[PDB]
Design a binder for this molecule. Structure first.
Ligand code: NAG
Ligand code: NAG
Ligand code: NAG
Lengths: 108, 106, 121, 123, 198, 247, 99, 121
């Protein structure tokens, strides 16, 4: 199985701030990975598939970049609705593993 | 999932008469997905009746099935020395295919 | 685009099995692939099974052989999962997710409301 | 000529594996199908499984689905069986049946049958 | 392959020289036009069709060819002019488990007229008994999925294909390539060209 | 689409073309040279159809022939654009030109034109219902006591659409004015009939005083006089008068 | 020599194309005859005949009745190839993979 | 004029991969194609595959697919063959053979002395 972790596990951001989340796998998995956004209490929503393509209805300010074993999701301008959990998922070979889950929060 | 009860187990008729064979299914099966097979002792089975009413190529005209709703029947209109063998029937529905116990004619 | 309804919350003893349904309404049904994914409160996400009803290829998780089977019905455009030998740690919520031929089967573009199944004594 | 020629009898031991196949010729084998059955001496026929030559989708019997495999090849137009975990009760004659076809419409049901292979498992 | 995309190309300047860098080795068969002389004359409309097929089947995309993809999925006319470009893409469209996103039609009652699309998914009745939508006997699902895997050989690895078609109508040509230029000189008896003015 | 039944049916009036409708035949520059060219021109002193709009609502569907000379004495820019095509429906390819206050849009597209197309601050466009399968699109700078006289010449030659325009501030005035090339289009369709569009100031709607004239082109030979700056200053029709033929 | 089926019309005075420019040039004031007949039965392999090549890239057109059998790399951009088949660095010879 | 030299005899275990080289000197290396054939100790020749380094095309025998890789280098004008998943019966002599441009690529013109490979326990 492909064991991956995403860093940081928790990041503090503010409105209008530029932040990025990195996600690295164990070995090469080509570009077979998708990004998932989950507000606490509801089902996660897909944002990026093929690690670069933008799903219909997803705002274009979401940006994904990656070739293999290291993928980065970049946010240019942040909005208060962005504070949620982001999940990785690879689908190269069977037994599709997920990421741990990163938390984005406002500074207290 | 599909059981085709067969009766009687043994048959004893002399040539020149008419014998009866029946494969009774335990559930509802479509007529276009069942077949009847007869094999001589030690020989491979051959297809006799497919669709419960249509003969195959080379099948003698003496054979004529009934093709009821869920209880298929095959009535032999004329018996010959070749017809003395064992008979089996199979179901072709979505359920795993099963065979009958086998009818022996003397 | 497509509206999904899952089953309801269920409470059952560990010594039994739970059947969860997922009904799809919207667009063509023969071009959809169905996946089942687990959400435990104490940890993150984990995948369970993946199936194409129209092509008939089923692939479960490596740690769930003989435990959960997923089957879909063409006439009702529904899918059902049954999981036997319920364990105490198997108390969580089940989400039903969909794949599209225009896109990728493995990914899940849309998600359902979810079914919360719990086990206790 | 429309015919299904099958391999010869083989003898093995418990715990080993067997490989049996039958060759097809005399008809359009691109859109046919094959099923395999087994029958002990003096016993009734038992269905094992089937596979589509042009698709490869296979369906197994509930009892033997953990120890049966079905493969087929276009160039050699042959249907293969591999059976693992042999037992003393596996001594039966295996048959392969295919419908008739003419590249336009195929026969309804399995009409022709193979010669059969007698396999004995003993030590 | 069965749902091959169709794109219209018109009112543009096209440089075909860039296409030579897609891969170190890739087929560039051109029918009726010399590939090196595509930057001089120009056409009225250009059609581009893109899809993915098995590498071995790449020989079935050609005028006068027969097979399975040729007559059931994509047929080219006998009097066809244009080019076909196919390069290996096993690095981009391969899954270790196996990809299933690519489908091809397998059974059809008749052949395909050149440049025709067939997206029907209704079950194929091989025999005489109408199964009415069940995959039993004499009824197989016409669509089959390529199980692309990087462990496959070169004869089964995915190959991306892009087919260009050209033609002439009474409408003026607009899809013409670049014309280059040269620095200007003054006060010297020189040969000049100004928009085709010798 | 909104059908209008407040039309006032009157026969179209007539007027004299005088010496209007001369355009630069080509891109070459000449000075102090009398040049004779054979091309489609508007004959001197010919009938030109007259249309009024005021409650006069004159929006007929006129033929195209080999060309049209379109002129309009107007103010406040009531006329906005024109429609071109053969059957004026989605079954055949059609061309559309509109000049709203924003910009100019040219679309050659399979519109389903309304029976009475027009425009209605004006942001109500009841001109067509659908645009199905279509390929060409172009955008450019807008073309824009009666004080506005706008003259246009439309030609469709071998798949090319040529538009000539001239705007002069002021019946058809007496004088001379050459028309300069404006836009060339490689449309490549067939055109046999055309129609204009109006902008109605809602108030239901109030239409101001405006008039436009339509003349048709047929081939003949002219003699053009270029001054020393390359501008056409006068012309002679070579098939009107025996004296002109001698000239 | 042996050429493709549709290239047989390129063997004529004043013609233009790949063959008439980079492989074989006929003079404008040519006199004589040309004979071309199909030979699919003697120059075809099911696996594919690769012994028949043709030049694709050249610096300049060939003068009439000239032979050029050089196999050097072709430098199609500004960066010099230095004998490698890299980006904008093409081998000028291809194959008539006859079947 | 032109001669081919091949590596020495090799003995190795069943579970490994064998490396054999083939160096050719003389002529223009760009018009050369490399072909490999196996000679069983008690049987005749058996074709394996053909490589054309200049045209960059490779083809191998059907029953050697996925096990044989033939490569060539312009820098040192040598041919490298790698074979994996060795078994019992492959004990034979490996011949390196060559094809010129004027002759047929598929046919073998010049041959090396051959190397003996043996596998045992
Ligand atoms: C315009 O037409 C009217 C009637 O058709 C005619 O009397 C008049 O002479 C025409 N104009 C000229 C300049 O001939
Ligand atoms: C218009 O021109 C097209 C060709 O450009 C021709 O096919 C069509 O018949 C023409 N229409 C009429 C009414 O003549
Ligand atoms: C030509 O242009 C010059 C300056 O551009 C001007 O002085 C002269 O009057 C013009 N000629 C005419 C006839 O208007």
């Amino acid at each position: 199985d492909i064991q991956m972790t995403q860093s940081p596990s928790t990041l503090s951001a503010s409105v209008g701030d530029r932040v990025t989340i990195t996600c690295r796998a164990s070995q090469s998995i080509s570009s077979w990975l998708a990004w998932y956004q989950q507000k606490p209490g509801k089902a996660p929503k897909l944002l990026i598939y093929k690690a670069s393509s933008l799903e219909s209805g997803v705002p274009s300010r979401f940006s994904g970049s990656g070739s293999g074993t290291e993928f980065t999701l970049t946010i240019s301008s942040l909005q208060p609705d962005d504070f949620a959990t982001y999940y990785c998922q690879q689908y190269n070979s069977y037994s599709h593993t997920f990421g741990q889950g990163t938390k984005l929060e406002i500074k207290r | 999932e599909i059981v085709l009860t067969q009766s009687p187990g043994t048959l004893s008729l002399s040539p020149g008469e008419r014998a009866t064979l029946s494969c009774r299914a335990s559930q509802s099966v479509r007529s276009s997905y069942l077949g009847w097979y007869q094999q001589k002792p030690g020989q491979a089975p051959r297809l006799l009746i497919y669709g419960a009413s249509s003969r195959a190529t080379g099948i003698p005209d003496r054979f004529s099935g009934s093709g009821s709703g869920t209880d298929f029947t095959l009535t032999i209109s004329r018996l010959e020395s070749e017809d003395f063998a064992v008979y089996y029937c199979q179901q072709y529905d979505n359920s795993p295919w099963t065979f009958g116990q086998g009818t022996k004619v003397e | 685009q497509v509206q999904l309804v899952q089953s309801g919350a269920e409470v059952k003893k560990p010594g039994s099995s739970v059947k969860v349904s997922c009904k799809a309404s919207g667009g063509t049904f023969s071009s959809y692939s169905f996946i089942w994914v687990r959400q435990a409160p104490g940890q993150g996400l984990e995948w369970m099974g993946r199936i194409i009803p129209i092509l008939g290829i089923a692939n479960y998780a490596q740690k769930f052989q003989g435990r959960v089977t997923i089957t879909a019905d063409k006439s009702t455009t529904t899918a059902y999962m049954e999981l036997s030998s319920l364990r105490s740690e198997d108390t969580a919520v089940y989400y039903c997710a969909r794949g599209t031929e225009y896109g990728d089967y493995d990914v899940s573009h849309d998600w359902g409301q979810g079914t919360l199944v719990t086990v206790s004594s | 000529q429309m015919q299904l020629v099958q391999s010869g009898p083989e003898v093995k031991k418990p715990g080993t594996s067997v490989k049996v196949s039958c060759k097809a010729s005399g008809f359009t084998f691109s859109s046919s199908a094959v099923q395999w059955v087994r029958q002990a001496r003096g016993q009734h026929l038992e269905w094992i499984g089937w596979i589509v030559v042009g698709s490869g989708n296979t369906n197994y019997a509930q009892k033997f689905q953990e120890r049966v495999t079905l493969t087929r090849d276009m160039s050699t137009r042959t249907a293969y069986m591999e059976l693992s975990s042999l037992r003393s009760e596996d001594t039966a004659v295996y048959y392969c049946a295919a419908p008739n076809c003419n590249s336009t419409t195929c026969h309804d049901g399995f009409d022709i049958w193979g010669q059969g292979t007698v396999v004995t498992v003993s030590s | 392959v069965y749902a091959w995309n169709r794109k219209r190309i018109s009112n543009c300047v096209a440089d075909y020289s860039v296409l030579y860098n897609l891969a170190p080795f890739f087929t560039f068969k051109c029918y009726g036009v010399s590939p090196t002389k595509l930057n001089d004359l120009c056409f009225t409309n250009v059609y581009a069709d893109s899809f993915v097929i098995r590498g071995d089947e790449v020989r079935q995309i050609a005028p006068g060819q027969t097979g399975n993809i040729a007559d059931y999925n994509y047929k080219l006319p006998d009097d066809f002019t244009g080019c076909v470009i196919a390069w290996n893409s096993n690095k981009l469209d391969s899954k270790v488990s196996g990809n299933y996103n690519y489908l091809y039609r397998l059974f059809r009652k008749s052949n395909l007229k050149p440049f025709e699309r067939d997206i029907s998914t209704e079950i194929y009745q091989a025999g005489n008994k109408p199964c009415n939508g069940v995959a039993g006997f004499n009824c197989y699902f016409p669509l089959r999925s390529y199980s692309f895997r990087p462990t496959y050989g070169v004869g089964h690895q995915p190959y991306r294909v892009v087919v260009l078609s050209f033609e002439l109508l009474h409408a003026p040509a607009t899809v013409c390539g670049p014309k280059k230029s040269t620095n200007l000189v003054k006060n010297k008896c020189v040969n000049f060209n100004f928009n085709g003015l010798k | 689409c909104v059908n209008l039944t407040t039309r006032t049916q009157l026969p179209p009036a007539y007027t004299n073309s005088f010496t209007r409708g001369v355009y630069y035949p080509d891109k070459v520059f000449r000075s102090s040279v009398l040049h004779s060219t054979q091309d489609l021109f508007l004959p001197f002193f010919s009938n030109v159809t007259w249309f009024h709009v005021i409650k006069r609502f004159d929006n007929p569907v006129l033929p195209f022939n080999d060309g049209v000379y379109f002129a309009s004495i107007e103010k406040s820019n009531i006329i906005r654009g024109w429609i071109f095509g053969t059957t004026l429906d989605s079954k055949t390819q059609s061309l559309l030109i509109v000049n709203n206050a924003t910009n100019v849009v040219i679309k050659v597209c399979e519109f389903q034109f309304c029976n009475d197309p027009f425009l209605d601050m004006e942001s109500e466009f009841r001109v067509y219902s659908s645009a199905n399968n279509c390929t060409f699109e172009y955008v450019s700078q807008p073309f824009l006591n009666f004080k506005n006289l706008r003259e246009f010449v439309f030609k469709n030659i071998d798949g090319y659409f040529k538009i000539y325009s001239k705007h002069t501030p002021i019946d058809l005035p007496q004088g001379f004015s050459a028309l300069e090339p404006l836009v060339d289009l490689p449309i490549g369709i067939n055109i046999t009939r055309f129609q204009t569009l109006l902008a109605l100031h809602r108030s239901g709607w109030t239409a101001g005083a405006a008039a436009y004239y339509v003349g048709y082109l047929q081939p003949r030979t002219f003699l053009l006089k270029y001054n020393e700056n390359g501008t056409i200053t006068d012309a002679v029709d070579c098939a009107l008068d025996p004296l002109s033929e001698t000239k």
